């Protein structure tokens, strides 16, 4: 068990610890960053006045 390899988390999952051992699922109304290091809020698209 002392010897292991590092594999990136899939889309929609992140991690913020040194040795993750598991990919934490992103909470609802949030999505993973580009580097899968911190969830960010999604985007709402509608015909706005801005």
């Amino acid at each position: 068990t002392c010897c292991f390899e590092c594999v990136e988390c899939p889309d929609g999952e992140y991690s913020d610890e040194t040795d993750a051992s598991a990919c934490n699922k992103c909470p609802d109304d949030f999505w993973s960053n580009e580097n899968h290091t911190s969830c960010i809020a999604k985007e709402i698209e509608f015909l706005s006045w801005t």
């Binding site: 068990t1 292991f4 899939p10 889309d11 051992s21 598991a22």
Partner: protein, 54 residues
């Protein structure tokens, strides 16, 4: 070197079925091994595969 005839072995003296000792139920299919911290590599978690893989 080893030769064992299983037809004449009575497990626990009465049973006729080979017992089980593995620390972890086998992962069935379409699933991946996992890691439990602080425990030997013999014991795992059976996580499911990411979308788009097999």
């Amino acid at each position: 070197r080893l030769f064992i005839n299983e037809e004449k072995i009575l497990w626990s003296g009465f049973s006729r079925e080979v017992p089980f000792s593995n620390c972890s139920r086998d992962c069935l299919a379409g699933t991946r091994k996992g890691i439990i911290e602080g425990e030997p590599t013999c014991c795992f978690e059976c996580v499911e595969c990411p979308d788009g893989e097999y």
